[PDB]
Amino acid sequence: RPLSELVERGWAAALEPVADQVAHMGQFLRAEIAAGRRYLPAGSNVLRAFTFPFDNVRVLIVGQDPYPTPGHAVGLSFSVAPDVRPWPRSLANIFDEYTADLGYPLPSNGDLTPWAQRGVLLLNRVLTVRPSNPASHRGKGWEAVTECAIRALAARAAPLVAILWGRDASTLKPMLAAGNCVAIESPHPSPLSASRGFFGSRPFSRANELLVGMGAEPIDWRLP
Ligand SMILES: O=c1[nH]cc(Cl)c(=O)[nH]1
Ligand SMILES: [Cl-]
């Protein structure tokens, strides 16, 4: 019940304003299971982005909703388990822009853990979904929780670059209007939108140049 049991302490402190809302989400999800409507990712993964330190975030990535196919979503936006192939479509697209931007080899697997360990917060606007039903928990109460997370990140003294992928960009930028923050957007990396501005957007090196402009250290994006 205390957030301190589910997330890292800095996050628990940051999210105390929505701790009741998080408790109501737990009840909603419990009811979904009782109704035979599973949800994804696994319960223990829902708040996984908030298990890496709040104080160490330098880059915030915000996507839309978790992967709807069972066996994909792991609670870090866009990430999959390291044995997963094919990669989901959005991640394949992400990884092509990665190589085009940074010149590194194509990654071996789809596990974005290393980014999360290096201060990239891999957030979705909505933290759960019903299996095979894209975006099906929109409007169910997560937006209050992720707004609190974003706003708390922005309120810290430290430099932050937010990378906003998809339709939530315009709602989120006002949350990130503060002096130590830069928010950069593009259409979502899913294939129907990616062709319209995700490809060629160079978010990884852009984010690093902006961090260096703020006197912060750039992210080591290199995946194995
Ligand atoms: O974790 C995510 N997976 C898939 C999508 Cl489309 C997204 O926006 N976020
Ligand atoms: Cl996808």
Which residue numbers are catalytic? 65
80-100: string of b/e by CB count within 10 Å (b at 16+)?
beeebeebbebbebbbebbee
Please tell me whether the peptide bond between 41 and the residue prior to it is cis, using omega within 30 degrees of 0.
Answer: yes
What's the N-to-C CA distance of the chain in angstroms? Answer: 37
State which ligand 1 atom lies nearest to the alpha carbon of 64.
8
Q: Rounding to the nearest 10 degrees, give the CA dihedral for residues 60, 220, 99, 124.
A: -20
Q: What CA–CA distance (Å, rounded) separates 100 from 98?
A: 6
Contacts 24+ apart (CB under 8 A), 149-157: 149/11, 149/14, 149/15, 149/50, 149/123, 150/60, 150/62, 150/123, 150/175, 150/176, 151/175, 152/14, 152/15, 152/54, 153/14, 153/54, 153/57, 153/60, 153/121, 154/178, 154/180, 154/181, 156/55, 156/180
Q: Strand 120-124's sheet: what is its strand order?
A: 120-124, 59-63, 160-165, 181-186
Whole-number Å distance, alpha carbon 7 to ligand 1 midpoint, is 21
Whole-number Å distance, alpha carbon 76 to ligand 1 midpoint, is 9
Verify whether ligand 1 is closer than 6 Å to residue 67 (CB atom): yes
167-193: string of b/e by CB count within 10 Å (b at 16+)?
ebbeebeebbeeeebbbbbbbbbbeeb
Give the resolution value in Å.
1.9
No. of H helices and E strands in the chain? 8, 4
Verify whether ligand 1 is closer than 6 Å to residue 93 (CB atom): no
Q: What CA–CA distance (Å, rounded) separates 150 from 11?
A: 11
State which of 45, 72, 90, 138 you would mutate to test the pocket of ligand 1, scoring each by most atoms of that ligand within 8 A of its C-beta. Answer: 90
State which ligand 1 atom lies nearest to the alpha carbon of 134.
6
Nearest bound ligand to the CA of residue 46: 1
Q: What CA–CA distance (Å, rounded) separates 156 from 164?
A: 19
Look up residue 209 and give its two tokens: 């140049």
State which of 61, 78, 125 you would mutate to test the pocket of ligand 1, scoring each by most atoms of that ligand within 8 A of its C-beta. Answer: 78
Q: Which residues contact 104 (CB under 8 A, 6 or more apart)?
A: 98, 221, 222, 223
For residue 47, what is the DSSP state?
A: T
Verify whether ligand 1 is closer than 6 Å to residue 198 (CB atom): no
State which of 67, 111, 188 you would mutate to test the pocket of ligand 1, scoring each by most atoms of that ligand within 8 A of its C-beta. Answer: 67
Domains in the chain, start-ordered, CATH in brackets?
1-224 (3.40.470.10)
Q: What CA–CA distance (Å, rounded) separates 111 from 224?
A: 9
Beta-strand relationship, 120-124 and 181-186: unpaired
